[PDB]
């Protein structure tokens, strides 16, 4: 039976991610189902088969046609023929954007470093024009030697003076995204990249 109550977030494209906790060991793909349905004329319930997140924890990725701000869903957690939980979810109240990707460092200019990466959204999504980024650089064996850069100029690039980083040392870098919308939290981190600094 259910311990902690299902909570959801939305990427504001097509995927909403929900999380709950059972007691003890549970296999989510075989035992449980999460039914979701848009409050909308003649709507049908869709069904999401969850995957496991450690022992008593499940996660579901709710596929969605679209996300607009008035969209509201009802949520029904079943366990076979037994209904465990009823709830509701509004994607525009809980935005968590996608992680950026393809993070690349460019070595080809003395004095100035160039980092590039991709916006994970298509041009016609709202967030595409409204993403802030946070770029985190640190030396691989000394996390206290770090930098954080805020990128608000709506372009997935960053330039840094090479003299700000130690030579003969290797650095890591990762990037996350923030939506200028309301009710947003930070994305996950990109995969990180590594280079040896020196000039």
């Amino acid at each position, epitope marked *: 039976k259910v311990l902690q109550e299902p909570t959801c977030v939305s990427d504001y494209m097509s995927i909403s991610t929900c999380e709950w906790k059972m007691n003890g060991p549970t296999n989510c793909s075989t035992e449980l189902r999460l039914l979701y349905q848009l*409050v*909308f*004329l*003649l*709507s049908e319930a869709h069904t999401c088969i969850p995957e496991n997140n450690g022992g008593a924890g499940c996660v579901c990725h709710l596929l969605m*046609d*679209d996300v*607009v701000s*008035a969209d509201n869903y009802t949520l029904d957690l079943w366990a076979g023929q037994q209904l465990l939980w009823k709830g509701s979810f509004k994607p525009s109240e809980h935005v968590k954007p996608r992680a950026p990707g393809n993070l690349t460092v460019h070595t080809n200019v003395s004095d100035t470093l160039l980092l590039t990466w991709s916006n994970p959204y298509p041009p016609d999504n709202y967030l595409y024009n409204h993403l802030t980024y946070a770029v985190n650089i640190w030396s691989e064996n000394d996390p206290a030697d770090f930098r954080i850069y805020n990128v608000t100029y709506l372009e997935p690039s960053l330039r840094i003076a090479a003299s700000t980083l130690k030579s003969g040392i290797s650095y890591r870098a990762r990037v996350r995204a923030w939506a200028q919308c309301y009710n947003t939290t930070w994305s996950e981190w990109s995969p990180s990249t590594k280079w040896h600094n020196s000039y």
Partner: nanobody
Amino acid sequence: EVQLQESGGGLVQPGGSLRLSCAASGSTSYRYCMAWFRQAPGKGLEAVASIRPRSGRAYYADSVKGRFTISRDNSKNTLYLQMNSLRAEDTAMYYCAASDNDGNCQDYWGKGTLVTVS
């Protein structure tokens, strides 16, 4: 606010088909919900088919599933209802409706077109 005008009704043979249309005086793409409802003489209104104008995702009442198709041409601001395998039971006045802030489809209504099957 939006104005709506249906067309495409008439007499039909049981088994035959028909296509309805509903021009809108403004962008279909800014509507949240768009749908067809129907009356029938001695009876109350019932929703038949609905659509999400942006994505195109369509929904249907059981009685028309497999026979009716709802669609939209956003460039013409127009909504359609392809009606196949028509039965005597489908005899009614047919209406296009729409709404902007909720999925009830009750804000805007057309005048209706009769569909008689005999």
